[PDB]
Design a binder for this molecule. Structure first.
Ligand code: CL
Ligand code: CL
Ligand code: CL
Ligand code: K
Ligand code: MG
Ligand code: MG
Ligand code: MG
Ligand code: MG
Ligand code: MG
Ligand code: MG
Ligand code: MG
Ligand code: MG
Ligand code: MG
Ligand code: MG
Ligand code: MG
Ligand code: MG
Ligand code: MG
Ligand code: MG
Ligand code: MG
Ligand code: MG
Ligand code: MG
Ligand code: MG
Ligand code: MG
Ligand code: NA
Ligand code: NA
Ligand code: NA
Ligand code: NA
Ligand code: NA
Ligand code: NA
Ligand code: NA
Ligand code: NA
Ligand code: NA
Ligand code: NA
Ligand code: NA
Ligand code: SR
Ligand code: SR
Ligand code: SR
Ligand code: SR
Ligand code: SR
Ligand code: SR
Ligand code: SR
Ligand code: SR
Ligand code: SR
Ligand code: SR
Lengths: 46, 237, 194, 119
RNA sequence: GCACGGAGGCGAAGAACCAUGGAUUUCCGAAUGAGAAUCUCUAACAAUUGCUUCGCGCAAUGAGGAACCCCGAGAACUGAAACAUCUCAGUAUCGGGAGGAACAGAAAACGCAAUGUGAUGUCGUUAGUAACCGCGAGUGAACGCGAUACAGCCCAAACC
RNA sequence: ACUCGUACGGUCACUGAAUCCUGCCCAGUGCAGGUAUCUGAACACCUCGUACAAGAGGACGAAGGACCUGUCAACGGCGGG
RNA sequence: GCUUUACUGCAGGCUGUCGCUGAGGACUCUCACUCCGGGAGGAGGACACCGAUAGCCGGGCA
C-alpha cells in the first residue's frame, strides 16, 4: 500500500504504544500492558 | 410479487441505459436566419454508433463543422445547401414548402425548426405528396399520411444504409454486438419461463400463460404484458 | 372619515371583481415566473400588513412565497398495512399551506423571525402568501415599542414551533372554551389528539 | 395603469406641479394617499394629484372613482418622486391634494379645465 | 498526580494545595478561502440573510446538550381468544425547533340558567360520570369545586 | 430511462436453425370496434319537503355494461350418441 | 411465499363534473395557459396540463 503522512503518524504512535510497562513502574506500584499488539495476530484501524 | 423487467427499465440504471458517452452527435438541421446563404462541403463519411448507418461530416462556409444525417448518394467533396433557396438536389435541406410534390424526403421536422424527427432510420424516407399554403402532406415510412406545417424543414433523398435489415444476424454473437450499442437489455427470457413471482405468465407445471395475453389499455404497469390492447391477433381472418 | 387603507381592504374582499381582478390576472403572470421566495419592497395588501404589525422601518421585511396547491404528496406504503392505513390519495397534511409558506420564507432568511403572513391569491396550481419578517438584531427594531418583543431569545425560530398567528389557529387554539379541550395548552401535552 | 384612463401631456403635467409648488408656499396642500383621501371625502380638496408609478396599484386605485363621485378634479403625474418633490417632500408621494390653492387658483382652475377636455 | 522506584530538583524570595480572575491553548471538528480518512494548496464570515458608508464595513444563522418542551411525519407485533371498523397508539421510530424550563394566557369564555363565575398552566376531585363503539372488545372528556400561584397589558383604525 | 433514438425504429409477448408444413372452432373468457334502443354517478337544473337545511323524487346521461361485429401464431377447445 | 371470477381495500388507467378560465347543442376569437423557435415569431387555446370529486376497470399492490 501507500501510506499518507498522517497514516504514518498514526502507525508510528501505535508502534510506540506497543511497548512494555517500564520496570520502575513495577516497583513503585509494588506489582502489564493491556494494549500490547502483534502485527500478525492483531489488526490496527484504517 | 417482484417488479417485472419492464418496471426495472424505468429506473434508468446502467444496465438499461444507452452508451451515450460513445455516441457522436444529434444530426439536427442547422439554424439559418434566412436567405439560404448557407452551403458546406462534405469533408468525410463516418459510422454513426447510435444508428448503424453512415453520417456525413460537413464544413459550412461560415466555418461550422458538424455531422449531418446523410441520405444515400452523398460523398466527400460534394457540396450541400441549407435554406429556403437551396437547390433541389439530394443532400440539401429546405422547408417542405420549397420541395416539389412527389419527392422522397428524410429527417423531416415535426415542428418547424426542431431539427428533424421523422424518417431518420436506415434506408427509409417520407414521401412529400400534397402542397399548400397551410399544410404539407407527407406519407411517412409506416404508410401514415402526416399533416405538417409547410415550414417544417427536410432533406431530399432517402436515408443512407438501406437494406441493412435484409441480412440475417445468423448468430447470437452478432445480435450481441449490436445490442451493446443500444439502450437495451438483451437477451430475452420469456415470461412463461419465469417463476410466478416474477411475471404474470410465470409458474405452472408446463410453461403457458395461464391467462389470455390480450391485455387492456387501462392495465397498470406490472400487469400490462403480452399483447397490449390488441385490436386482433393471429394471421387468420 | 374612511382611511385610504379601508379601500385596499374592501378591494380584497372580492379579488375576483373590479380593478383588482384585472390586477391579479396581470400580476400572476409575473409571479409564475418568479421563484419560491421573492423579497418585495412593499406589501401588496398594505392595510392587511399594517394591521398585522407591519411598519415602514429598517429591519422589517416582506417576501412573497408560492406553494403547490392540493393535498398531501404522499408515497404509498411499502410494507404491510391494515386497509385503514393504506390510503394515499385523499390524505391531507395537518399543516395548512399558509404555514408551509411561512416556514419556507423563514428558511430563506435564517436571521429573521416570522411576524405574520397573509394571502395574496392563487391560480389553479399554486397559492401565494406574503410574509412579514423582522430583524431582531437591528437597533431600529430593538428600540421599537411595538416590535422589540420579538427580539427575545425564546422567539427564535418561532414559526417552526407554531408560535405564529397562523400557527396558533392551525393548532386549534382559537376557542377559549368548548372544543379546545385537546388543543390548549399544546397538542403534544394532550397526547396529540386535537 | 388599471386606474389610469388617459395620458396627461408632459407639458400639462409641468404646469400642475408648478401650481402645486406655489400651492404649498401660498395656499394649502395635503401629502400622502391617506390625507389626500380624507380631503376628497371631506370635500376640502380642489385638485388631487396621483402618481402613475405606484406599486402596488391598490394604494391609489380608489382615487379616480372617489373623486368623480365628489366632483373633485384629479390629474396623473408620470413620476412618484416628482409629486413628492413638488409637494415639498424629501421622499415620494403616491398622491397629493391641493386643499385650497393660493395665488395659483387661476392656473389650478385652468389645469382642471384642460383635464375635463382631455376626457 | 494515579504510582509505596532510582536519580535529580523545588520550597522561608513562603513551594505543595484550594478559591477567584487572567495567560498560553497544535490539527481535525458547525468547520466557514479551496481541497483532503486529522493533511495539503494559493488571502478568505464558505453558504443564506439583515443593515448598508453598497466595501464582508457592521451584524445574524449553522453545531452541541441526560432528559424535559413545542411544531410536523407516523407503524406493526398485540387485544377483540379468527378478523376488516375498533385496539395496541398518536405509542415506537423519523423530520424541524426553542429554553432553563417550554407551551398557554387577559373571553366573539362559561351556561352548577344565574340578582351567578371572571386570563392561563398545574394538582386533587368531578368520573370510568357524559360521550364514543362489529353498541362487541374496548376508548373516554368538560363545566364546576378544593388547592397552588396570581397580573395585567400593547397594536390596526378613527383624529393629528 | 428508453433517447446524441424516430417505423430498415423500439417497446410488449409467444415460438425456437434449415427443410415440408401449420386444419376446424369467436359459444364461454380476454382484447378491440360499433351501437337505434335499454341501463349508467356526481355537480348544475326542476318538483315536493324545510320561513333555511337534512331528505324524497324527476329530467339530462360520460366511460362502462346490455346488444352487434372483428380476432385463435388470444386464453383455450376439437366429445358422447 | 405464491394463486385466483375468495373477502375487503389500495395504487394505476379510462370517463363526467368543478376550479384554473377569457371575449364574441353547434360555432368563432385571443388574453390566460401549453408547445416549437437563438430571436422575431409560429402552432395550439380556454382545451390540454394541474388541484378536487364522481362512475367503470383494477391480484399491479396490501
Ligand atoms: Cl435489432
Ligand atoms: Cl421565525
Ligand atoms: Cl360558574
Ligand atoms: K391491526
Ligand atoms: Mg521497536
Ligand atoms: Mg440528431
Ligand atoms: Mg449492454
Ligand atoms: Mg427468449
Ligand atoms: Mg423454473
Ligand atoms: Mg404475479
Ligand atoms: Mg408452451
Ligand atoms: Mg403608542
Ligand atoms: Mg404543558
Ligand atoms: Mg478548513
Ligand atoms: Mg386477535
Ligand atoms: Mg384511532
Ligand atoms: Mg367478537
Ligand atoms: Mg383514545
Ligand atoms: Mg363545559
Ligand atoms: Mg418452448
Ligand atoms: Mg427450449
Ligand atoms: Mg421545452
Ligand atoms: Mg395477496
Ligand atoms: Na495485522
Ligand atoms: Na428565519
Ligand atoms: Na381531533
Ligand atoms: Na485551555
Ligand atoms: Na458569521
Ligand atoms: Na458586504
Ligand atoms: Na386471539
Ligand atoms: Na390469525
Ligand atoms: Na368501532
Ligand atoms: Na370464443
Ligand atoms: Na414461505
Ligand atoms: Sr491471519
Ligand atoms: Sr433531437
Ligand atoms: Sr435542439
Ligand atoms: Sr404460467
Ligand atoms: Sr387461421
Ligand atoms: Sr436556529
Ligand atoms: Sr420612496
Ligand atoms: Sr387572578
Ligand atoms: Sr423450424
Ligand atoms: Sr370472443
Amino acid at each position: 500500500g501507500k501510506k499518507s503522512k498522517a497514516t504514518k503518524k498514526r502507525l508510528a504512535k501505535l508502534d510506540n504504544q506497543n511497548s512494555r510497562v517500564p520496570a520502575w513502574v513495577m516497583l513503585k506500584t509494588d506489582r502489564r500492558n493491556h494494549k500490547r499488539r502483534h502485527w500478525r495476530r492483531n489488526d490496527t484501524d484504517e | 410479487g417482484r417488479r417485472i423487467q419492464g418496471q426495472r427499465r424505468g429506473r434508468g440504471t446502467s444496465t438499461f441505459r444507452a452508451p451515450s458517452h460513445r455516441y457522436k452527435a444529434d444530426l439536427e438541421h442547422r439554424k439559418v436566419e434566412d436567405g439560404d446563404v448557407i452551403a458546406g462541403t462534405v469533408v468525410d463519411i463516418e459510422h454513426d454508433p447510435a444508428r448503424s448507418a453512415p453520417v456525413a461530416a460537413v464544413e459550412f462556409e461560415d466555418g461550422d463543422r458538424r455531422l449531418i444525417l446523410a441520405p444515400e448518394g452523398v460523398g466527400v467533396g460534394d457540396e450541400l445547401q441549407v435554406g429556403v433557396s437551396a437547390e433541389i438536389a439530394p443532400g440539401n435541406t429546405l422547408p417542405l414548402a420549397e420541395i416539389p410534390e412527389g419527392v422522397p424526403v428524410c429527417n423531416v421536422e415535426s415542428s418547424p425548426g426542431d431539427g428533424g424527427k421523422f424518417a431518420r432510420a436506415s434506408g427509409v424516407n417520407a414521401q412529400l405528396l400534397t402542397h399548400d399554403r397551410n399544410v404539407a402532406v407527407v406519407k411517412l415510412p409506416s404508410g401514415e399520411m402526416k399533416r405538417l406545417d409547410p415550414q417544417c424543414r427536410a432533406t431530399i433523398g432517402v436515408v443512407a444504409g438501406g437494406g441493412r435489415t435484409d441480412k440475417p444476424f445468423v448468430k447470437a454473437g452478432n445480435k450481441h454486438h449490436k445490442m451493446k450499442a443500444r439502450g437495451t437489455k438483451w437477451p430475452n427470457v420469456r415470461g412463461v419461463a419465469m417463476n410466478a413471482v416474477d411475471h404474470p405468465f410465470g409458474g405452472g407445471g408446463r410453461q403457458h400463460p395461464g391467462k389470455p395475453k390480450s391485455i387492456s389499455r387501462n392495465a397498470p404497469p406490472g400487469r400490462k404484458v403480452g399483447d397490449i390492447a390488441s385490436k386482433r391477433t393471429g394471421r387468420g381472418g | 372619515a374612511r382611511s385610504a387603507y379601508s379601500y385596499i381592504r374592501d378591494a380584497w374582499e372580492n379579488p375576483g371583481d373590479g380593478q383588482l381582478a384585472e390586477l391579479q390576472w396581470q400580476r400572476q403572470q409575473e409571479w409564475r415566473n418568479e421563484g419560491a421566495v421573492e423579497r418585495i419592497e412593499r406589501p401588496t395588501r398594505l392595510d392587511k400588513a399594517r394591521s398585522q404589525g407591519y411598519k415602514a422601518k429598517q429591519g422589517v421585511i416582506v417576501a412573497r412565497v408560492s406553494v403547490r396547491k392540493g393535498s398531501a404528496r404522499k408515497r404509498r406504503h411499502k410494507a404491510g398495512r391494515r386497509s385503514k392505513r393504506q390510503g394515499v390519495t385523499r390524505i391531507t397534511r395537518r399543516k395548512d399551506i399558509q404555514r408551509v409558506a411561512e416556514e419556507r420564507a423563514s428558511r430563506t432568511f435564517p436571521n429573521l423571525r416570522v411576524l405574520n403572513s397573509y394571502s395574496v391569491g392563487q391560480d389553479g396550481r399554486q397559492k401565494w402568501h406574503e410574509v412579514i419578517l423582522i430583524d431582531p438584531n437591528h437597533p431600529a427594531i430593538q428600540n421599537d415599542d411595538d416590535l422589540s418583543w420579538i427580539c427575545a431569545d425564546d422567539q427564535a425560530d418561532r414559526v417552526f414551533r407554531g408560535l405564529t398567528g397562523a400557527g396558533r389557529r392551525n393548532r386549534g387554539l382559537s376557542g377559549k372554551g368548548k372544543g379546545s379541550e385537546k388543543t390548549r395548552p399544546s397538542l403534544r401535552s394532550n397526547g396529540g389528539k386535537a | 395603469p388599471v386606474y389610469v384612463d388617459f395620458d396627461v401631456p408632459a407639458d400639462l403635467e409641468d404646469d400642475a406641479l408648478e401650481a402645486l409648488e406655489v400651492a404649498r408656499d401660498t395656499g394649502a396642500v395635503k401629502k400622502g394617499t391617506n390625507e389626500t383621501t380624507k380631503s376628497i371625502e371631506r370635500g376640502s380638496a380642489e385638485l388631487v394629484f396621483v402618481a402613475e408609478d405606484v406599486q402596488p396599484e391598490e394604494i391609489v386605485m380608489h382615487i379616480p372613482e372617489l373623486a368623480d363621485e365628489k366632483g373633485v378634479p384629479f390629474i396623473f403625474v408620470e413620476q412618484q418622486d416628482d409629486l413628492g418633490h413638488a409637494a415639498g417632500l424629501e421622499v415620494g408621494s403616491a398622491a397629493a391634494a391641493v386643499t385650497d390653492a393660493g395665488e395659483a387658483d387661476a392656473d389650478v382652475e385652468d389645469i382642471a379645465d384642460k383635464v375635463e377636455e382631455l376626457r
